Write an enzyme that holds these catalytic residues in place. Structure first.
Site, short mmCIF file in Angstrom:
data_model
loop_
_atom_site.label_atom_id
_atom_site.label_comp_id
_atom_site.label_asym_id
_atom_site.label_seq_id
_atom_site.Cartn_x
_atom_site.Cartn_y
_atom_site.Cartn_z
N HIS A 530 45.06 -42.69 24.38
CA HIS A 530 43.98 -43.12 23.49
C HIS A 530 44.47 -42.99 22.06
O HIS A 530 44.47 -43.96 21.29
CB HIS A 530 42.72 -42.27 23.73
CG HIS A 530 41.52 -42.69 22.92
ND1 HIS A 530 40.72 -43.75 23.27
CD2 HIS A 530 40.97 -42.14 21.81
CE1 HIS A 530 39.75 -43.87 22.37
NE2 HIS A 530 39.87 -42.90 21.49
N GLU A 531 44.89 -41.79 21.69
CA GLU A 531 45.11 -41.48 20.28
C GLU A 531 46.31 -42.27 19.76
O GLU A 531 46.30 -42.76 18.63
CB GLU A 531 45.35 -39.99 20.08
CG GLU A 531 44.12 -39.14 20.30
CD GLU A 531 42.91 -39.71 19.59
OE1 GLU A 531 43.06 -40.18 18.44
OE2 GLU A 531 41.80 -39.67 20.18
N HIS A 534 45.65 -45.91 19.17
CA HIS A 534 44.82 -46.21 18.01
C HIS A 534 45.71 -46.67 16.88
O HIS A 534 45.26 -47.34 15.95
CB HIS A 534 44.07 -44.99 17.50
CG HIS A 534 42.77 -44.69 18.20
ND1 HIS A 534 41.72 -45.57 18.20
CD2 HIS A 534 42.33 -43.58 18.83
CE1 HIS A 534 40.69 -45.03 18.84
NE2 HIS A 534 41.04 -43.82 19.23
N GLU A 593 37.98 -48.59 19.84
CA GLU A 593 37.87 -47.53 20.82
C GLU A 593 38.13 -48.04 22.22
O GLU A 593 38.74 -47.37 23.04
CB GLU A 593 36.49 -46.87 20.73
CG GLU A 593 36.30 -46.11 19.44
CD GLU A 593 37.29 -44.96 19.26
OE1 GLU A 593 37.82 -44.42 20.25
OE2 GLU A 593 37.50 -44.55 18.11
N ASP A 597 41.01 -46.89 24.87
CA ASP A 597 40.74 -46.41 26.23
C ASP A 597 41.58 -47.12 27.30
O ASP A 597 42.13 -46.47 28.19
CB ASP A 597 39.26 -46.60 26.57
CG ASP A 597 38.39 -45.58 25.91
OD1 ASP A 597 37.17 -45.80 25.87
OD2 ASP A 597 38.85 -44.55 25.39
N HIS A 658 32.47 -45.65 19.44
CA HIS A 658 32.73 -45.63 20.89
C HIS A 658 31.69 -46.42 21.67
O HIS A 658 30.54 -46.51 21.27
CB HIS A 658 32.77 -44.19 21.42
CG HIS A 658 33.57 -43.25 20.56
ND1 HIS A 658 33.07 -42.71 19.39
CD2 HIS A 658 34.82 -42.75 20.69
CE1 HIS A 658 33.99 -41.94 18.84
NE2 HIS A 658 35.06 -41.95 19.61
N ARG A 664 32.48 -46.91 29.20
CA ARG A 664 33.90 -46.62 29.09
C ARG A 664 34.56 -46.49 30.46
O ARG A 664 35.58 -47.11 30.72
CB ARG A 664 34.12 -45.37 28.26
CG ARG A 664 33.57 -45.48 26.86
CD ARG A 664 33.72 -44.24 26.04
NE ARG A 664 35.09 -44.04 25.63
CZ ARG A 664 35.45 -43.26 24.65
NH1 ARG A 664 34.53 -42.58 23.97
NH2 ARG A 664 36.73 -43.13 24.34
S1 STS Z 1 38.32 -41.23 18.75
C1 STS Z 1 38.73 -39.80 19.79
C2 STS Z 1 38.18 -39.86 21.21
C3 STS Z 1 38.85 -38.77 22.03
C4 STS Z 1 38.68 -39.00 23.51
C5 STS Z 1 39.31 -40.08 24.10
C6 STS Z 1 39.17 -40.31 25.47
C7 STS Z 1 38.39 -39.45 26.24
C8 STS Z 1 37.77 -38.36 25.64
C9 STS Z 1 37.91 -38.14 24.28
C10 STS Z 1 36.72 -39.64 21.21
N1 STS Z 1 36.09 -38.67 20.51
C11 STS Z 1 34.78 -38.75 20.74
C12 STS Z 1 33.66 -38.03 20.32
N2 STS Z 1 32.44 -38.39 20.76
C13 STS Z 1 32.27 -39.41 21.61
C14 STS Z 1 33.34 -40.16 22.09
C15 STS Z 1 34.61 -39.86 21.67
N3 STS Z 1 35.82 -40.36 21.90
ZN ZN Z 2 39.23 -42.99 19.71
#
Ligand code: STS
Ligand code: ZN
Ligand code: NAG
Ligand code: NAG
Ligand code: NAG
Length: 696
Positions: A530-531, A534, A593, A597, A658, A664
Site C-alpha cells: 500500500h504505502e 502510493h 487509496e 490497495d 479511503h 476495500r
Molecule cells: S493511507 C494508510 C492506510 C494504511 C493501511 C493500508 C492497508 C490496510 C490497513 C491500513 C490507511 N490508514 C487508514 C486510516 N483509517 C482508515 C483507513 C486507512 N487506510
Molecule cells: Zn493509503
C-alpha cells in the site's frame, strides 16, 4: 501437521470468531471473513465507526493511560510535561469551575465575537481589518479562515520551505453539506443552532441581554456567508492534480491578479503576509515567491467578500475558532455541541475523558508519548523483521515492472529508480529513547500548569504555529519522522519519498513474529505495499526520487496510467453504500487509496509466494479448514471487519480518501485472480468478474 502453539491458538481463535463460514467466500467475502464480528458487535455510543482497526486504536489508548497516569521519580522533564498535561486534561472539576471564563479572557484578542459583544464596531472596527484579523487567528492560534496561508514544503524543491495560499476548510465536513437539504438538513440546522447556543452562553456569562431573533439574525447571516465560501471552493476531484495545483507567484502577481475588497480597502497581501510572518521576526518582500493552490477560489472570493460587513466576516471568522474551543470548557459549554456532533458523527456521547486526553497529549507531544509507548509495548526485534519484509516487498514491486505491459522501457526504469530511493521508517526513532537532551529540548519552550488545561492548549497552538512558520528560510530536516510511534497507521510522504510504519500498527492482526507469515504478509505486508504503491498513485507518480514535483513519465505511459486507473474509478464509483443511504462512492477521490490497495495486496502475495518457494509451506492453523493462501486473504479482509453509523457514512463518503472497509475487501479481491484461485470461484461469481482492473 497443525501448528499448536500459544500464538497459533490465539491467531486461529480470532480468525474463527470473526468469520462467518456460513457464507460462500465467492458470493460475499466481506460477509464470509467478517460475518461473525458483524453479529456480535454493536457500534459504541461514542464511536462513529467501529471495527478491528478502531479496536486497536482503543487498545493503544489503554497503554497510553497506563504510562501517563503515574508520576515516576526518574521521569525526565519532557515526560513530566506530558503527564502534567495529561493531569491538567483529565481534571474536569478544575475545568468546570472556570466555566467559559478562559474563553472570555481570549475573545478580545482575536478581535471579538460581535454577536456576543456590545458595540463591536466602536471597540474594534477601528483597529479591525481583515489582514490584521485573519492573520491573528492564523499565526497565534493556527486557525485558518477565509484565506489559508501556511508555511509548507515546496513541491518542486523538497529541501526548501515556501509560503502557500490555499482555500480554507469549512465548519461542516465538506462543501456538499452546504446544500443543507435531505441528508444534510439536520447538520446545517444543528450547526446554526450550535452557533446560536454558544453565543447565548457567552452573552449570559457576560451578563449581556439576549434577543433570540437577533441571534438567529446574525448566525443565519454567518451561514449564508459560509454557504457562498463553500460554493466557491474547488472540489477534491478538481484538486487532485499536483501539477495543476502548483502555481508559483510573487506576492506582486498575487496582489495584481487576485485583488480583494474587504470592508473597503482593498486587501494588502503584503500586509496580510507580514502580520503573519512578523510573528516570528521574518520579513517578506512583495517579491516573495508563493505557491498558490486555489487561484480560482481567490478569484471567486472577490465579489463574495465585497458584500458582507466586517461584522459578518468576523462573526464567521471567530466562530470557526470558538467551534473548536468549547469542548475544552465547562460542561455547559461541552453540552452545546451535543446535537452538532450527533449530526456529523452519529455519536450520542463524548468518548471517555482519559482517552480524549491520552490522544491529545499524544497529538502534541508525539515523541515523548511515543518513547513511553515503545518502552511499555514494543519489543525491539519486530522492527528487524519488518525491515526485511520491506526489502522483500520493494524488490517485488521492482520485479513486476517487467510484467506490466502499459509502461514503456524508460518509464519502467525511472519507476525502479524512484523505488530504490524510498527510505523506510520503522517502529520509532531511536533518538527518542537514547537521547534525553534532544527530547527535553523539543519541549523546552513549553511549561504547563496542572490546573490550567485551557491555558495549556492555547499555548500548544501558539508553539505549534510559531514552530512551523520559522521553517520558511530553513531547510527540511531529513531526520524528521512524520508520525509518532504511538499511532495505529502508516504513511507515505511524497516530499520525503519515505514510508513510515509506527510501532502502533506493528501488532496483530497486521504483524507478529510469532504469528504465521501468511497472516503477516496479508496484514503488514499488504500494508507496506500500500504505502510503496502510493509513491506511484495518481498523486505520488508526479513526484520524483528526491520528492520533487517533476514529470518523469512519457506522455504515452502517463496516458495509459490514467487509462488503467480509470478502470478503478468506474468499479468503485459503482458501489452503492447502504449506510450512506445508497449513495455511490466517489471513484476519483478514493482512486489513490484504491490503487494502493490493489497494488499493495498483489505485491504482498507475490512476496509470500516468494517466501514459501524459498522456505517451504507453513504448518496449518488448528480449527480452520483453510490453507495459507486462503489465510493470507482472510487476514487481509479481517483488518477491515467494521461498520459505520449512517451519519458518519454520509460524512465519510465525502471526506475520506479511503473506501469504506467493506468495499476495500471487495474492491481488491474482485481484481485479484489469486484470490479466486484460492477459493475456487466460478467465472462471474460476484467476487470474480471476468473484467478486472490492474495498474501496479
Ligand atoms: S493511507 C494508510 C492506510 C494504511 C493501511 C493500508 C492497508 C490496510 C490497513 C491500513 C490507511 N490508514 C487508514 C486510516 N483509517 C482508515 C483507513 C486507512 N487506510
Ligand atoms: Zn493509503
Ligand atoms: C483538580 O484541580 C484542582 C485545581 O483547583 C485541584 O484542587 C484538585 O485537587 C485537582 N484534582 C486532582 C485529582 O488532581
Ligand atoms: C499592516 O497594515 C496595517 C493597516 O492598518 C498597519 O496598521 C500595520 O502596521 C501593517 N503591518 C504590517 C506588518 O505591515
Ligand atoms: C459505473 O461504471 C460505468 C461503466 O464504465 C460508468 O459509466 C459509470 O459512471 C460508473 N458509475 C459511476 C457512478 O462512476
Amino acid at each position: 501437521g497443525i501448528c499448536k502453539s500459544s500464538d497459533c491458538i490465539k491467531s486461529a481463535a480470532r480468525l474463527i470468531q470473526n468469520m462467518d463460514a456460513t457464507t460462500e467466500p465467492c458470493t460475499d467475502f466481506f460477509k464470509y471473513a467478517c460475518g461473525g464480528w458483524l453479529k456480535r458487535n454493536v457500534i459504541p455510543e461514542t464511536s462513529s465507526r467501529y471495527g478491528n482497526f478502531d479496536i486497536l486504536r482503543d487498545e493503544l489508548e489503554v497503554v497510553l493511560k497506563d504510562v501517563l497516569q503515574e508520576p515516576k521519580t526518574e521521569d525526565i522533564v519532557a515526560v513530566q510535561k506530558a503527564k502534567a498535561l495529561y493531569r491538567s486534561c483529565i481534571n474536569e472539576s478544575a475545568i468546570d469551575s472556570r466555566g467559559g471564563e478562559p474563553l472570555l479572557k481570549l475573545l478580545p484578542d482575536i478581535y471579538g465575537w460581535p454577536v456576543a459583544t456590545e458595540n463591536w464596531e466602536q471597540k474594534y472596527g477601528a483597529s479591525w481589518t481583515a489582514e490584521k484579523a485573519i492573520a491573528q487567528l492564523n499565526s497565534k492560534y493556527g486557525k485558518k479562515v477565509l484565506i489559508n496561508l501556511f508555511v509548507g514544503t515546496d513541491d518542486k524543491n523538497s529541501v526548501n520551505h515556501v509560503i502557500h495560499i490555499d482555500q480554507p476548510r469549512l465548519g461542516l465536513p465538506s462543501r456538499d453539506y452546504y446544500e443543507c437539504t435531505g441528508i444534510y438538513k439536520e447538520a446545517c440546522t444543528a450547526y446554526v443552532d450550535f452557533m446560536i447556543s454558544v453565543a447565548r452562553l457567552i452573552r449570559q456569562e457576560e451578563r449581556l441581554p439576549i434577543d433570540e431573533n437577533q441571534l438567529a439574525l446574525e448566525m443565519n447571516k454567518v451561514m449564508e456567508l459560509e454557504k457562498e465560501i463553500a460554493n466557491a471552493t474547488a472540489k477534491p476531484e478538481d484538486r487532485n492534480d499536483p501539477m495543476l495545483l502548483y502555481n508559483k507567484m510573487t506576492l506582486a502577481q498575487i496582489q495584481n491578479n487576485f485583488s480583494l475588497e474587504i470592508n473597503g480597502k482593498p486587501f494588502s497581501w503584503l500586509n496580510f503576509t507580514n502580520e503573519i510572518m512578523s510573528t516570528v521576526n521574518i520579513s517578506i518582500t512583495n517579491e516573495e515567491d508563493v505557491v498558490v493552490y486555489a487561484p480560482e477560489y481567490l478569484t471567486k472570493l472577490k465579489p463574495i467578500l465585497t458584500k458582507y460587513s466586517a461584522r459578518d466576516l468576523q462573526n464567521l471568522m471567530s466562530w470557526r475558532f470558538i467551534m473548536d474551543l468549547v469542548s475544552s470548557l465547562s460542561r455547559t459549554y461541552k453540552e452545546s455541541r451535543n446535537a452538532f456532533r450527533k449530526a456529523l458523527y452519529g455519536t450520542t456521547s463524548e468518548t471517555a475523558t482519559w482517552r480524549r486526553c491520552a490522544n491529545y497529549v499524544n497529538g502534541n507531544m508525539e515523541n515523548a508519548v511515543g518513547r513511553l509507548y515503545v518502552e511499555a509495548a514494543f519489543a525491539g526485534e519486530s522492527k528487524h523483521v519488518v525491515e526485511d519484509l520491506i526489502a522483500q516487498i520493494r524488490e517485488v514491486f521492482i520485479q513486476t515492472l517487467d510484467d506490466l505491459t502499459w509502461m514503456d522501457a524508460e518509464t519502467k526504469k525511472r519507476a525502479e529508480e524512484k523505488a530504490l530511493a524510498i527510505k523506510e521508517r520503522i517502529g520509532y526513532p531511536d533518538d527518542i529513547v537514547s537521547n534525553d537532551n534532544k527530547l527535553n529540548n523539543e519541549y523546552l519552550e513549553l511549561n504547563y500548569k496542572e490546573d490550567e488545561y485551557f491555558e495549556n492548549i492555547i499555548q500548544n497552538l501558539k508553539f505549534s504555529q510559531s514552530k512551523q512558520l520559522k521553517k520558511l528560510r530553513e531547510k527540511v530536516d531529513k531526520d524528521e519522522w512524520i508520525s509518532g510511534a504511538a499511532v495505529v497507521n502508516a504513511f507515505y510522504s511524497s516530499g520525503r519519498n519515505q514510508i513510515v510504519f509506527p510501532a502502533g500498527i506493528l501488532q496483530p492482526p497486521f504483524f507478529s513474529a510469532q504469528q504465521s507469515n501468511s497472516l503477516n504478509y496479508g496484514g503488514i505486508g499488504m500494508v507496506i505495499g500500500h504505502e510503496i504503491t502510493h509513491g506511484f498513485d495518481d498523486n505520488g507518480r508526479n513526484f520524483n526520487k528526491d520528492g520533487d514535483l517533476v514529470d518523469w513519465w512519457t506522455q504515452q505511459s502517463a496516458s495509459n496510467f490514467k487509462e488503467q486507473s480509470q478502470c478503478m474509478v468506474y468499479q468503485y464509483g459503482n458501489f452503492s453504500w447502504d449506510l450512506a443511504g445508497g449513495q455511490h462512492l466517489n471513484g476519483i477521490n478514493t482512486l489513490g487509496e484504491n490503487i494502493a490497495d490493489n497494488g499493495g495486496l498483489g505485491q504482498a502475495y507475490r512476496a509470500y509466494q516468494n517466501y514459501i518457494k524459498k522456505n517451504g509451506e507453513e504448518k496449518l492453523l488448528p480449527g480452520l479448514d483453510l490453507n495459507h493462501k486462503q489465510l493470507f486473504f482472510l487476514n487481509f479482509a479481517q483488518v477491515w471487519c467494521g461498520t459505520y453509523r449512517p451519519e458518519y457514512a454520509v460524512n465519510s463518503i465525502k471526506t475520506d480518501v479511503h473506501s469504506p472497509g467493506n468495499f476495500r475487501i471487495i474492491g481488491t479481491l474482485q481484481n485479484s485472480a489469486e484470490f479466486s484461485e484460492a477459493f475456487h470461484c466460478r467465472k462471474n461469481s460476484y467476487m470474480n468478474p471476468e473484467k478486472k482492473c490492474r495498474v501496479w
